[PDB]
Amino acid sequence: RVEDALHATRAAVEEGVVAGGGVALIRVASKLADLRGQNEDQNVGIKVALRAMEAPLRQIVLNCGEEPSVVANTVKGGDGNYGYNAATEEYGNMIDMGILDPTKVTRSALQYAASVAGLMITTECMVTDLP
Amino acid sequence: AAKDVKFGNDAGVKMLRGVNVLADAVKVTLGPKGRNVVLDKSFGAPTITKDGVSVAREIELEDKFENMGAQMVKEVASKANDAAGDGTTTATVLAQAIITEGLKAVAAGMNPMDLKRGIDKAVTVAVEELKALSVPCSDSKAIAQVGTISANSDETVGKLIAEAMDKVGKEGVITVEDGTGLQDELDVVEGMQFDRGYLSPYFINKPETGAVELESPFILLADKKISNIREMLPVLEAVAKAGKPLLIIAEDVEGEALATLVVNTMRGIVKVAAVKAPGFGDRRKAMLQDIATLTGGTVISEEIGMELEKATLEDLGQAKRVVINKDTTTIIDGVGEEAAIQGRVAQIRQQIEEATSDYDREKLQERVAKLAGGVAVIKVGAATEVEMKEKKARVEDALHATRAAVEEGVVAGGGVALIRVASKLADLRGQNEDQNVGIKVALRAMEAPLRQIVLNCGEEPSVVANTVKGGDGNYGYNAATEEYGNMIDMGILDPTKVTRSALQYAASVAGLMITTECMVTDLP
Amino acid sequence: AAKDVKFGNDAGVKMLRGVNVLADAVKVTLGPKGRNVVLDKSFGAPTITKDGVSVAREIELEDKFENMGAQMVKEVASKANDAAGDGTTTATVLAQAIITEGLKAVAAGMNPMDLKRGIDKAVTVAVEELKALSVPCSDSKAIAQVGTISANSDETVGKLIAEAMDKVGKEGVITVEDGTGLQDELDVVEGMQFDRGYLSPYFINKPETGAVELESPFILLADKKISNIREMLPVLEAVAKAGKPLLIIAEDVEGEALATLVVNTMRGIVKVAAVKAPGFGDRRKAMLQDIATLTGGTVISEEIGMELEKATLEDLGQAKRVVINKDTTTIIDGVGEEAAIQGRVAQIRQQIEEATSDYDREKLQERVAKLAGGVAVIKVGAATEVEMKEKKARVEDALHATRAAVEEGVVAGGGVALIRVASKLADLRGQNEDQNVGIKVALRAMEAPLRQIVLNCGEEPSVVANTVKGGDGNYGYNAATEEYGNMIDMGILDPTKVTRSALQYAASVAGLMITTECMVTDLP
Amino acid sequence: AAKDVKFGNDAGVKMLRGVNVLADAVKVTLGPKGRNVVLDKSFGAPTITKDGVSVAREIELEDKFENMGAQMVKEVASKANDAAGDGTTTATVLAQAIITEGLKAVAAGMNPMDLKRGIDKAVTVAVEELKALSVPCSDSKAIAQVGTISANSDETVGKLIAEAMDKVGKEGVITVEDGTGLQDELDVVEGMQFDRGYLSPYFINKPETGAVELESPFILLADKKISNIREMLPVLEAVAKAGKPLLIIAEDVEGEALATLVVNTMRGIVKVAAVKAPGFGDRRKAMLQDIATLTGGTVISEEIGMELEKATLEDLGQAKRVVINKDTTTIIDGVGEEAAIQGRVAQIRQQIEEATSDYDREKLQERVAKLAGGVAVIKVGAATEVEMKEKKARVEDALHATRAAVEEGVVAGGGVALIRVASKLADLRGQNEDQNVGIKVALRAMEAPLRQIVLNCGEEPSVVANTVKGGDGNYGYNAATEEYGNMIDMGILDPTKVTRSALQYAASVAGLMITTECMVTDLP
């Protein structure tokens, strides 16, 4: 427990702490609704990313046996660290309720995800051995 | 022949696959963002259609058990359209959802009888709630409004209905016909409607209404059962000689002579149709005479010793038009003299004076209402034949919707009334825990129509359901404009009678299907 | 290697087949009218058994997913027998029951987490009820009674247990050995027990107890981790030269030298076993020295600069017998001298005088308890070798049961306690409706053992269940006599600890299994 | 490995098909008109036999479940032959018959536990009846008679047994060896028999008796458990140097050194065999010393601090012959001196003077009986080698039969005693109706041997059974002459012990098999 807590706190002193349970990802996506790119395909690129950023909360809420698109919709409509606490199944301020991730982990998850996704979307050819 | 017999869950899963193919085909059409279904023809180009009733009619499945599931739901859902002028697709959607969760509850070991009691309790209570959500449609301004809304915002059509209903009563009989110029016309003529349909689906010469429609027909009134065709010939020939078609109203037309008429109008030899005389026993003999007076006909009854063979054209009544349904016959413009009809009315109005029983009185009051009520004929005018025929269909639709709406009022459309009443029954409970899940099955099914409409919009059904539920009264989602609001002001509504019927009929087959243990059919 | 992955219901149905083969095989044995299972051998004639533990151990299934279900249940059920000395088959029957209805409710769409919370709540409450139903077993008369009940009505075996427990305390350490004549003997000896098992299942030279049993063994005490076998050789040879076996008590014996001992006792080159030294940090160093004094050995610690290479036979402790479990080591008759042991006790009894903390005090009192407590040895006598060996088994069983009984009492047997506590919780609820069915799943599973027992009798299980539930207290069905009565008076009882553990462990895997969404295993 | 698992009737039909292949193969040989069975060899020409024990020994079945059936009946039936010297095929017939009707009753929904109780009660009562029908065989004239009947009417063989028994007691130890000329010889030699068999089937150097037979062997007596082979070498080499074989009598010979001896006599490096010392505890230490005195050996016990390493040839006892069974060891002609042996006897006869308990007394009287009893050696003479070897086999049979006959008497042979006691039990009942069919199954099964015997004669078995059951007493059918008669007069009889054992053993496997619900074995 100490070993885990130590790693988490190390990470938290570096880049801080943000709303957990999926909430910080969906919050930042809800603020980027007017983001645009050099052209139309770039725009749908941006919508792809923004919508993917909802998947973690939608999964969490689906494990709860709750309706994921209602909870997403309610969390998106709120401001700041407002979100859904899946432990207690109640909405509230995520930081007061003590449900948080170190910013470094949310950022890294996002960047690495987008990196393979990007590679994979821009793959034309695959080589492997004949079974 | 040798049968294939199935039991319990095996029979359950087959009925459920059957119902899924039916309902999934039909529900794609539902709501203002409904999709097309393509239906093949051997006749030429396939047909593209948003009409769920059309879709339904084509659905037949290869697996015999699956196909039984489909036909059961088809048969019962079409009873809604018959009762209310509309609702068959909604019934089909409701049925799919009650059946899907009920069979799940069966498989989980809950008691099918209790499940069914639960569903039925919920439906009873929901039906009282619709009654209470209903906004009445019963003055001339409301009638015009509802008629214009069903006629796609045509204030003219609404006008026409209201004028008809004013000329002959809200409950009065009203037909629609081709117009004669640009102008619409309305006039009231001698006529009558009774609750008896065609004796076989084959007399239907108008498949798009699924009706039988005859022009200047002779009418044979015969108080007796018609088995033999021997009795017919002398009259049947004399009718073919005048080149006019013929309506048979008899006690019954059975097996033999029935199949003959069916085949002999089929070849176009004579245009005939046959319906049961209305009522039973004594009230039947009397009602035949009513129609006789109306149409200047003579009743041929064997108690006076008359035979069908010794019957000429003279004996036959006549009318400018008759129209028959699955379960209705309406006689428009009867040749019968005004004096003869007036007399028959005065006569009956006089038996009303000496009826010594409540029941005798009502039965007589019903007969006078028919004979002395007449029929309003709306003739629809336009600038071209094409526009005329389209306005006629618009009027015909608006008429049925408005009829329903004066009976039981009007309620929030687009799926909203059903989800509204469900949100009010969250605390309903029954005799035991299985009954309670029955209730939940029904309540959740009641959301299926809105969820499908919102799904055809490409929106998130469970978010819209959730927002509509949390609101009050007629608040809902307008799928035409994709905005929330008061459904009645935005003019999106159903006649309560159609929402009530869709629910009751869907609950009826769902209940029967949930409580089925065995299915029997032929070996392929 | 490539995997085969399964999700939801598909995973569900596979674990349920797995569990049903396991449970069905094992449950035929249950109760006085239990049936035989035949288990095949390559060794010779197949074996015919009523021992459900034996049947379980053989069960392995061809489909990899089914087999995973079976192994999961085996693993957890056998924790009951470990904790309480009995219970494994009951756990299996409970698990089959919770799982079967839990997965049904999952397939019906209920929330798995909620189902589990419900099951857990019903278990928590039922265990409180078990505790309240329980009758203490804590005086000499009661001890004898329970002992003689577990030993098949043999008043002698009861006596023996009670005499042992009187000589050394209810919580004291007692073993059983072969006798020397007709007479039973009991004596108290220098010895000790600590909570450390064998380091690999392979040292087990007595598979029927699943124990390691060594005669006149040398004991190597080494305060340090043993990775290398290089350090061993000089001692290992000197031990093989005296022809006696060897116990290794060290901080740890890891990877390398561990695997070597495993293979080198496997070939019968030397009989070795290794166990972890007891406790951690400082209390470990001191306890190693306790064992040393007990056995007349010397501790080899590298903080004093001693190596395992420069270690002779002289350094090694000795004892007449040692016995090791999955999670126990017990040292019987240590060569250590009575003066040296008495001195160590007085020493510790003195640190007790100057402990300035509760904790340091309890920790010392526990060491003196072990060293100064000895071990009671029951040696079982009889008339022939055959009768002796059977009485020894009877005594061994009775001793485990009676140990469990002094801990937590006794409750109605033959399945009755379980059904009894279930019939008291009919009003129990949870935070919502799925939790409630969770509760109902557990409560109905609690009838399984009695229904099975009655089914082996060839009587109607639902009528016996129904009658037992209707009664109060320890009223129940005696399957031996097929009569109803007070189960405690009829002398049909289990130790509370076994009933409790069966239920807790069955509800554990059932909970895990009902909340599993994915399974992964290798492609056939 | 993955298992294949079977339940209820599936398991039943498999066990039945297995028992049928076994029983049908073996039963063709039954009685004087028994048929030949041909058994194939890779070795050369197949063998043609009428010995049902040899047939049985070959039967193994392809389907694993079937084969489990066959082996379970083989194992138990061969305990008869062990206990009584004969009966194995009879037991196979009985088992087939109880099995066949019992499974039929299980399949009919009768209660397997109650069927077993009925079978068991019938057999207990039938055994009392066998005992009452039984004729004692306990004076010299009767002993001759029984032995000459078992020896195929050879009055000589009869004489020889009687003479031996007279010289050494009815219960005394008697062996048979090759003769030295024409004359038979009988002499008494120092020697002993105790109840311990070989430690592995592999030491058997004489497979036709299934015995181990050693000539002029050295005997190692070691009071301790022999795990290591290290302790052995110094002695084992010194034994190989004299070229004589070796008997190990130790507390036990376990895993390691056991498997070594097994492989090292297998290669013919040294002829060794190992058996458990007799008895347990103190009576064991003493008895080892008895054997020591008999054979002029020294006991090597580690309580006196002696090691097996420091043991020479001097320490080893010697004898002219030893013979070991599945459950017997007999030492013939011990080198031990007459004075040393006489002194040990007088010593023990003196402990008999001061024994203060019944039990101590019997235990000592049993040891003197053994030591002071010797062994009778029958050496069989004839005119040619061939005739000698056949007479030896005849004497060997007759001896086992006559031994069994003095223990429990003699009863009507050829299937008659069993069918006789069955006709007397026609009114036997049980606690309920399933138990009663249990009784009937056992009673009808008791007919199967006589039915089989008559069937091999080519007569109608049911006509013979019916006539035999209508008579009284030892009235029955003689299958040698094919006439009815008094079985006792006609000299057709079996020792009561074999008829009793065949019944009891057949009923035992049949009962287990009838009450089996599950079978586990490996996937083919």
Domains and CATH numbers, chain B: 1-134+410-524 (1.10.560.10), 135-190+372-409 (3.30.260.10), 191-371 (3.50.7.10)
Q: How many CA atoms lie within 13 A of C503 on its CB side?
A: 34
Q: Please list every residue in chain A whose beta carbon sits closer than 8 Å to the beta carbon of residue C114.
A: 65
User: What is the three-state SS of C453-510?
Assistant: HHHHCCCCHHHHHHHHHHCCCCEEEECCCCEEEECCCCCCEEEHHHHHHHHHHHHHHH
At A71, list the tokens: 């909870």
Identity of the residue numbered D391: K
Residues of chain A in contact with residue C112, where contact means CB-CB under 8 angstroms, are 65
**How many Å apart are CA D63 and CA D521, to the nearest integer?**
10
Contact D5 C21 (CB under 8 A): yes
3-state secondary structure (DSSP) of residue D404: helix
Query: Is B179 labeled as ligand-binding?
Result: no
Chain C's closest residue to A62, CA to CA, is C111
D239-257 b/e (C-beta count within 10 Å ≥ 16 → b):
bbeeebbbbbbbbebbebb
Which has the closest alpha carbon to C320: C223, C196, C178, C198? Answer: C178
Which chain C residue has the Cα nearest residue A66? C111
The token pair that represents A20 in the structure block? 């957990």
Query: In this complex, do C114 and A64 lie within 8 Å of one another by their Cβ atoms?
Result: no
Give B136's DSSP letter. P
Rounded distance between C-alpha atoms, residue C112 and residue D263, angstroms: 59
Report how far residue D72's alpha carbon sits from residue D85's, in angstroms, rounded to the nearest whole number: 20
**D517/chain C closest Cα distance in angstroms:** 6
The answer for B120, left when phi > 0, alpha when psi is -120 to 50, beta otherwise, is alpha
Please say whether the beta carbons of D395 and D315 come within 8 A: no
Q: Tell me the C-alpha distance between C279 and C329, whole Å.
A: 13
Reading the block at residue D257, the tokens are 């050194």
Q: What gap in Å lies between CA B106 and CA C481, rounded to an integer?
A: 40
Distance from CA of A65 to the nearest CA of C (A): 6
Cα D442 from Cα D436, distance rounded (Å): 10
CB contact under 8 A, C107 and B105: no
Q: What angle do CA B499, B504, B508 make, to 5 degrees?
A: 150
Tokens of C109: 């769409």
Tell me the sheet residues that pair with D334: D319
What span, in angstroms and rounded, lies between the C-alpha atoms of C333 and B266?
A: 112
B134's CB contacts (< 8 A; 6+ apart) are B408, B409, B410, B411, B496
- Beta strands D329-334 and D317-324 are antiparallel
Do residues A16 and A103 touch, judged by C-beta distance below 8 A?
yes
Are chains D and A in contact at 3+ CB pairs closer than 8 Å? Answer: no
Q: Which tokens in the block code for residue D499?
A: 């008829």
Q: Is C180 exposed, middle or buried (0-12, 13-18, 19+ CB in 10 A)?
A: middle
Contacts of B212 (CB under 8 A, 6+ apart): B198, B203, B204, B205, B206, B273, B322, B323, B324
Other CB atoms within 10 Å distance of the CB of residue C428: 18
- Contact by Cβ (8 Å): B13, B66: no
Neighbours of D288 (CB within 10 A): 22
| Angle D461-D467-D473 from CA coordinates, rounded to 5° | 120
Radius of gyration of chain B from Cα atoms?
25
The verdict on whether residue A86 carries a ligand-binding annotation is yes
Q: Which residue of B has its CA nearest to C105?
A: B108
In the block, which residue shows the tokens 């089959």?
C96
CA distance D232 to D258: 11
Kind and range of the H or E run holding D379: strand D375-380
Contact C148, C157 (CB under 8 A): yes
Q: Let me know: does B52 contact B30? Beta carbons within 8 Å.
A: yes
Strand partners for B127: none
What are the tokens at D289? 């010393």
Residues C3 and C521: beta-carbon distance below 8 Å: yes
What is the residue type of C302? Answer: E
C-alpha distance from B408 to closest chain C C-alpha (Å): 37
Residues 6+ apart with CB under 8 A from A7: none
Q: Is A21 annotated as a binding residue?
A: yes
Q: Two tokens at D225?
A: 């458990």
User: How far is residue B95's CA from residue B502's CA, in Å, rounded to a whole number?
Assistant: 9
User: C104 and B104 in contact by Cβ < 8 A?
Assistant: no
Q: Give the Cα separation of C324 and C194 in Å (integer).
A: 10
D394 touches D388 (CB < 8 A): no
- Contact by Cβ (8 Å): D255, C268: yes
- According to DSSP, the residues that pair with A7 across neighbouring strands are none
Contacts of D381 (CB under 8 A, 6+ apart): D179, D180, D181, D182, D183, D184, D185, D388, D391
Residue type (1 letter), B138: S
Q: Among candidates D11, D113, D114, which has minimal Cα distance to D72?
A: D11
Task: Tokens for D340, please give them.
Answer: 């040393």
Which residues of chain B does C115 touch, with a Cβ-Cβ cutoff of 8 Å?
none
Residue B304 DSSP label: G
Chains C and B touch (3+ CB pairs under 8 A): yes
CA dist list (Å): C477 to C7, C31, C122, C126: 43, 12, 24, 20
- R_g (Cα) of chain D, nearest Å: 25
* Residue B73 near residue B92 (C-beta atoms within 8 A): yes
Residues 6+ positions from C342 with CB-CB distance below 8 Å: none
Which tokens hold the place of B27?
């529900």
Closest CA to D285 of C217, C319, C186, C181: C181
Which chain C residues touch B109 with a CB distance below 8 Å?
104
DSSP character for A101?
Answer: E
Q: Which of C40, C181, C268 sits opposite D68 (nearest CB)?
A: C40
Q: Is C478 annotated as a binding residue?
A: yes
Report the SS3 class of residue D206. Answer: strand
Alpha carbons D477 and D456: distance in angstroms, whole number = 13
Spatial separation of the C-alpha atoms in residues C246 and C238, rounded to whole Å: 11
The alpha-carbon gap from D57 to the nearest alpha carbon of chain C, in Å, equals: 12
Residue B138, burial from CB neighbour count under 10 angstroms (0-12, 13-18, 19+): exposed
Q: Are B72 and B508 spatial neighbours (Cβ–Cβ below 8 Å)?
A: no
Cα–chain center distance at C441? 28
**DSSP codes joined into one string, D320-362:** EEEEE-SS-EEEEEE-S-HHHHHHHHHHHHHHHHH--SHHHHH
d(CA C380, CA C159): 12
D37 near D43, Cβ under 8 Å?
Answer: no
Rounded-to-integer distance, Cα A53 and Cα A19, Å? 14
CA D147 to chain centre: 18
Distance of CA C171 to the CA centre of its chain: 16
CA D225, chain centre distance (Å): 28
| Helices B496-514 and B112-133, packing angle to 10 deg | 180
Question: What's the one-letter identity of residue B340?
Answer: A
| Residue C332 · residue C173 · CB < 8 Å | no
What is the rounded distance in angstroms from the CA atom of residue D268 to the CA atom of residue D274? 16
Contacts of A67 in chain B (CB under 8 A): 462, 466
The answer to whether B88 is annotated as binding is yes
What's the token pair of residue D102?
């019992």
Q: Which residues of C touch D (CB under 8 A)?
A: 21, 24-25, 28, 33, 35-40, 44-46, 48, 55, 58-62, 67, 178-182, 205, 215, 240, 243, 267-268, 271, 383, 385, 388, 456-458
A–C contact (≥3 CB pairs within 8 Å)? yes
Q: Read out DSSP for D148-204?
A: HHHTTS-HHHHHHHHHHHHHH-TTSEEEEEE-SSSS-EEEEESEEEES--BSSGGG-
3-class secondary structure, C412: strand
